[PDB]
Amino acid sequence: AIFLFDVDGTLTISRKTIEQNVVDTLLELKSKKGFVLGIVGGSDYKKIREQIKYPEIFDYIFSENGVVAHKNDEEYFAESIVNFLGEDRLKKLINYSLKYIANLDIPKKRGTFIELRNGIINISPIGRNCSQEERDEFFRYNLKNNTIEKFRDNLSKEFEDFDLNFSMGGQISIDCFPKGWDKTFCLKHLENKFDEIYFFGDRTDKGGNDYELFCDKRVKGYKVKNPNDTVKILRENF
Ligand SMILES: [Mg+2]
Numbered sequence: 001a002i003f004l005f006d007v008d009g010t011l012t013i014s015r016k017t018i019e020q021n022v023v024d025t026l027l028e029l030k031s032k033k034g035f036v037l038g039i040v041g042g043s044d045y046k047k048i049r050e051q052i053k054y055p056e057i058f059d060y061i062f063s064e065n066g067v068v069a070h071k072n073d074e075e076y077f078a079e080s081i082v083n084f085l086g087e088d089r090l091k092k093l094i095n096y097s098l099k100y101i102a103n104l105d106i107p108k109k110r111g112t113f114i115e116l117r118n119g120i121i122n123i124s125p126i127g128r129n130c131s132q133e134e135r136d137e138f139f140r141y142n143l144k145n146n147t148i149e150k151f152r153d154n155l156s157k158e159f160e161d162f163d164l165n166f167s168m169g170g171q172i173s174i175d176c177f178p179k180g181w182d183k184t185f186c187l188k189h190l191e192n193k194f195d196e197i198y199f200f201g202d203r204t205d206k207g208g209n210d211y212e213l214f215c216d217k218r219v220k221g222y223k224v225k226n227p228n229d230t231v232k233i234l235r236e237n238f
Pocket of ligand 1: 008009010201
């Protein structure tokens, strides 16, 4: 049996490192007669390893929603979005996005409008690099005019043919990933004779990242509030 965890918000306070109260609890699990630990999070592995200090507690580490798997701190294997779309359809979605981001009248435009990660293509009309304030400042401009929801409605319809999903990302970006690459993807790597897999996430409701995993019959899911509540949900049942 393996245990599965969301990184940001479930094992650590989001964007910061891991408190020692929690890691002491995981050590007891892999020290309880028959348990292995694995994690799945949207972030690239460098951020994840930074967040958890020790990748060695974890037999299997799945980053970018399981489209990237790691083991004993070696990469092993992981695919890319370009291998899915192909160089042609990509230079179609790309230059439609910039041509739209271009002619869009918003007050502040910056840079890194299209970030290519392994799993997703992050599209953002203001731009990825902007002082944390400009991030929040555009978030409220979004509440007034719903600028970003209008963006997805174009891509979601124009590229309905691409088998593509465009879900609203953070405050300033729309994540663009292939259909069925939510978080249930990491199930593909776990036919390793593992009888029961338990999962722990944050936003396990529809319109959330780890929602599609919970109701995937394959595994029992638990909804936790915060990391201190998580440690409670572990100690209580295990
Ligand atoms: Mg989370």
